Design a protein around this ligand. Structure first.
Ligand SMILES: [Zn+2]
Lengths: 138, 124, 104, 83, 99, 208
RNA sequence: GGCUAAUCCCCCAUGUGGACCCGCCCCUUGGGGUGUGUCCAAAGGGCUUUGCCCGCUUCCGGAUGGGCCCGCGUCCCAUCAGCUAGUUGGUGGGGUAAUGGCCCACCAAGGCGACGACGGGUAGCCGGUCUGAGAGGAUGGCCGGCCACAGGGGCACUGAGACACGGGCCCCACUCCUACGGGAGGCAGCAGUUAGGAAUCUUCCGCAAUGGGCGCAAGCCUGACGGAGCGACGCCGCUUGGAGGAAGAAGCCCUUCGGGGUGUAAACUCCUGAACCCGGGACGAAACCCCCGACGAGGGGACUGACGGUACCGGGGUAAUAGCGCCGGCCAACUCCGUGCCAGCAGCCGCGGUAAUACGGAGGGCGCGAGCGUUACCCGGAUUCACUGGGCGUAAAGGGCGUGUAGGCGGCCUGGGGCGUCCCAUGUGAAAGACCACGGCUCAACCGUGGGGGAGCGUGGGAUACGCUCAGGCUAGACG
């Protein structure tokens, strides 16, 4: 079965970007859409949009890359150099507002899920709350 | 191993094994000489290594190296063992402390005297 | 506060006493995942009220017998052997894994 | 019996007591019930005797029996002056 | 040798004997009474009970029975007695018994 | 006992001038004059590419032999300067320059650091009046470091305080050559010292 | 066997009151009130002696200390898998301050276990300590908290309290006295002896200070304690000198025989002056007590230090201990000579069989310095048990395959609950230690004062994204 929907999505994204896909579909879920909202706002993805594949709901994720490069291998630098799942089924990970990590010395983010909604580490710290540590992106 | 597995069986902590049953895990042990033989080296090395069977107060009967240019150990001489093997002599796990009990220090030792237990020579 | 617990009556085989199986959860001190252990308490049932399958609230009390420091505070939800089953089925595997072996 | 007494806390030749409320039976340097002051025998500093008279009076309020020397220090910080 | 405070042991023995003597009297009377109530004889059952009650409270006077030790004795006594008296009793003297 | 032994030989091993004698270490004889090669039967032979250790080692030995201090005491100062806030490197040097015995030297009372050590030791020194014979004594900002009255007449003290006429003083110090007084204004900063040292490597050496 | 006092023992009374039975009320496990019945008190002593002091009795309350119960946490081995009869529960009862199989009679047939019972081994536990970037690992000595024990085993008495280290009884072992019947002992208190061991101190001073027991007080007792003694055992501080002083003595080492090194080091000159001498000489001590005043508040007054004639102050005053390891690479430090797979070195790799920077000495050098080095052990390096932070085609590592129990894990939408999870407040998280600040001893080590942080758990309030649960729904999984 599909054991971890959230992890499935981060991977679909990690996988598509590595081959430079423009778009990329992932089965829609309220929660997954909540995450994508941050991904866009934090500028990691051009954005995303609801779509119907074979009749079922999906979320097109519009990938973003750096510009073309010089020398051999003109492949663009990724905008999403990283994106790793943390809390996972059978090893849930929650943090207090004092334990919210500082990803990549601030240049990267961390998406938490708080009783105040899905926020980034900075947002969470502001609202002074903690919660399940969904993932880490940079 | 899966996290759930780690939870079930968990990691096993490593157990170091002593290399010197000078028993009592003591720093030194005193014994009595039995045989002041002279073994031969291993693999490449060659020479007449001076050794000594010792009956420890720890109940163990062991073989010990006798460092130094020349010794004075005999059949029933009391000695002190300090632990430390000798790469060439299979079976020798401790050195004999020179300058203690019956083992006299090395004569004419003008350098690393701290070892070879020899007093400070009075410069004429 | 006299400690209050909730569990299931997995045994009604004694007089004025019942065996409540209180479940518990928590994060493993080193590997963090939420593990789930469980313990059986012998609770005092004077009226012989509570029956096998009942979910009850246990309350810290004054000793009643040796190995018995809890009284059935109240009933939370009646009948539901789906739980007693787990407990019994687990006791059943014990009926082996020794010199023979537990079914399946 | 609960007392108000001194507790050696200095060091060799550098004694420093702690006016304390403990049970008569403890080590003199054992676990007290509450600290309520301190005393520097040698007045090595301008501040060689604090007493928090508020609390003392409370303890005396209920059986605290001061060592003689403890009382003499408590008096100094006017724990008894009833003007 | 000689820690003159042997005196303590010396006295322990006396006290031991003094106590031991109070209690045996107590027990004797207690049964004595319980057994009278037992047989249904109202009057003398209570009459004796009152003595028992007395000796007990006095035992608790000094450090023999002392404490609730006395209380336990009395209750277990007045109880046993009034109940056994349920055999057509009717507490006459109603001594140690609030009718 | 802090070293005590041929000293212009350290000057040589560090291949750099060390003022472990105040005077003379000027008069064409600090030995670093026409003989800046290390002491011993091998001094003149070619030197090999030092190991990272060798370099860090030599750097610390320098910074340290400059204040004629024992590794033991030196190390503790460092571990102290490591805990306290602020660039360990300089903070460390600050503490080294706050040694009463150093200050005395810094204020011209003594010609060398050794000499100053003795003046402090033999009681010839003061700190806010009360005399202090502890070379490791840490001078704070706002302390007068005067010469002992009884010693103000000492031949030695009169010469040095004399030649001290005109001679300027560190910007973190100041002295009244009259009553032979002086004040520790503030903790010197890395810039204030023209030390042929690179604490960078000293910190790194205690990192190993 | 006889005499005798008391704050020793007893009886009667008074009953503020309290205890017990029964009834009732409020409370809610045995909490508080109330009515009848019953039951239960006491000791005196001292004076500045008609008053004050010390003390006695009953009850209620505080304070302190403690017993008992419960949640959670607390090593290794599964080559220990089944354990259990007072065993699990019940009813009546004993015993206790009190709950309870704690103990007993009777009844029932239970209780525990792979979420590791039972058994074997190891171990007092904690605050803390060592290490570590941390997580973690190791540890629990000194100091403080708790527990346990007092030659081994069992037992109770007396008491508020003990099953009672310097109290009692019995059995056992051992030691000593014995007129051989029978007795007396227990340093795991201070010091000390002996044995064992690589190894661990003075049969010291004092009751002055803090604390403790009795006493109205004076005061007595205190190997608790405050001190001194020994031991570089550790930490911190300090000395063995400072300045000048040759293109550079002699000796010793090396050399291309020109010279290079030891080296401003020495010699010598001048300066200061640890030790040591002389004089002064301490804090720690102010109470208790006396006097006035009400034995109060308050005021005044007197006595008292082991350390110790020590710290410290002043004067005088001598240049006055240096050692230990290392120099092949790791690793900072190189030459000659001797030796010849020898004698030896060695942590690893290795070195020595006629040129050895690796053996021994010497010269020179590097490190550290009243220390230096070795041995042992713990943490590190070791992400080499990997949670942080590893792996399994061929390096060690996929189970011979399946079926399936327990267990771990779980698609999309909505609603309830708020168990996990997050937040706030509050309580706790002792003192010591750790951290920061300021302060005391000439510094520091050490010590004092103050402040801050603190996982975890209790309590109240709140959030609801995720995980859980409950209810409902859906077809993208699965099945038909
Ligand atoms: Zn020079």
């Amino acid at each position: 079965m599909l054991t971890d929907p959230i992890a499935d999505m981060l991977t679909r994204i990690r996988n598509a970007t590595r081959v430079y896909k423009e778009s990329t579909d992932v089965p829609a879920s309220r929660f997954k859409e909540e995450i994508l909202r941050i991904l866009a706002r934090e500028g990691f993805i051009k954005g995303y949009e609801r779509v119907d594949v074979d009749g079922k709901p999906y979320l097109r994720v519009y990938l973003k890359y750096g510009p073309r490069r010089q020398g051999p291998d003109p492949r663009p630098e990724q905008v999403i150099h990283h994106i790793r799942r943390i809390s996972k089924p059978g090893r849930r990970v929650y943090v207090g507002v004092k334990e919210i990590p500082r990803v990549r010395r601030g240049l990267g983010i961390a998406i938490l899920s708080t009783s105040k909604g899905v926020l980034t580490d900075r947002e969470a710290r502001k609202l002074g709350v903690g919660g399940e540590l969904i993932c880490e992106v940079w | 191993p899966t996290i759930n597995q780690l939870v079930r069986k968990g990691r096993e902590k490593v157990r170091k094994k002593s290399k010197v049953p000078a028993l009592k895990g003591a720093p030194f042990r005193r014994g009595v000489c039995t045989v002041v033989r002279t073994v031969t080296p291993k693999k490449p090395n060659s020479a007449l290594r001076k050794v000594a069977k010792v009956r420890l107060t720890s109940g163990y009967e062991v073989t010990a190296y006798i460092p130094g240019e020349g010794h004075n150990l005999q059949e029933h001489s009391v000695v002190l063992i300090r632990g430390g093997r000798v790469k060439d002599l299979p079976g020798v796990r401790y050195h004999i402390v020179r300058g203690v009990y019956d083992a006299a220090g090395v004569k004419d030792r003008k350098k690393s005297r701290s070892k070879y237990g020899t007093k400070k020579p009075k410069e004429a | 506060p006299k400690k209050v617990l909730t569990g299931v009556v997995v045994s009604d085989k004694m007089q004025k006493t019942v065996t409540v199986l209180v479940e518990r959860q928590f994060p493993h001190p080193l590997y963090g995942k939420v593990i789930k252990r469980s313990k059986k308490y012998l609770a005092h049932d004077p009226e012989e009220k509570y029956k096998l399958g009942d979910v009850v609230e246990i309350i810290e009390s004054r000793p009643i017998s040796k190995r018995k420091r809890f009284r059935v505070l109240r009933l939370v939800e009646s009948g539901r052997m789906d739980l007693v089953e787990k407990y019994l089925i687990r006791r059943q595997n014990y009926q082996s894994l020794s010199k023979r072996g537990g079914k399946a | 019996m609960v007392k108000i007494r001194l507790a050696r806390f200095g060091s060799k030749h550098n004694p420093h007591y702690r006016i304390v409320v403990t049970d008569a039976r403890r080590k003199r340097d054992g676990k007290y019930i509450e600290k309520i002051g301190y005393y520097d025998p040698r007045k090595t500093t301008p501040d060689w005797l604090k007493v928090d008279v508020e609390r003392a009076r409370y303890w005396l309020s209920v059986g605290a029996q001061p060592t003689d020397t403890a009382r003499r220090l408590l008096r100094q910080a006017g724990v008894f002056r009833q003007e | 040798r000689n820690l003159s405070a042997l005196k303590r042991h010396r006295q322990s023995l006396k006290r031991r004997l003094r106590n031991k003597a109070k209690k045996s009297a107590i027990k004797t009377l207690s049964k004595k009474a319980v057994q009278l109530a037992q047989e249904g004889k109202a009057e003398e059952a209570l009459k004796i009970m009152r003595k028992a009650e007395s000796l007990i409270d006095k035992a608790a006077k000094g450090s023999t029975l002392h404490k609730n030790a006395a209380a336990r004795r009395k209750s277990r006594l007045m109880r046993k007695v009034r109940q056994l008296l349920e055999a057509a009793g009717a507490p006459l003297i109603g001594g140690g018994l609030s009718a | 006992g802090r070293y005590i032994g041929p000293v212009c030989r350290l000057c040589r091993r560090e291949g750099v001038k060390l003022y472990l004698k105040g005077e003379r270490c000027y008069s064409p004889k600090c030995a670093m004059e026409r003989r800046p090669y290390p002491p011993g039967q091998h001094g003149q032979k070619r030197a090999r590419r030092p190991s990272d250790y060798a370099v860090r080692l030599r750097e610390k030995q320098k910074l340290r032999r400059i204040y004629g201090i024992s590794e033991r005491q030196f190390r503790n100062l460092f571990e102290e300067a490591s805990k306290k806030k602020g660039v360990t490197g300089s903070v460390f040097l600050g503490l080294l320059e706050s040694r009463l015995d150093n200050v005395v030297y810094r204020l011209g009372f003594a010609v060398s650091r050794r000499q100053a050590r003795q003046l402090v030791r033999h009681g010839h020194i003061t700190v806010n009046g009360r005399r202090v014979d502890l070379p490791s004594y840490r001078v704070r900002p706002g302390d007068e470091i005067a010469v002992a009255e009884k010693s103000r007449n000492l031949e030695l003290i009169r010469q040095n305080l004399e030649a001290m006429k005109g001679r300027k003083v560190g910007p973190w110090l100041s002295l009244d050559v009259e009553g032979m007084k002086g004040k520790f204004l503030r903790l010197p900063d890395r810039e204030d010292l023209a030390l042929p040292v690179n604490e960078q490597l000293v910190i790194e050496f205690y990192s190993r």
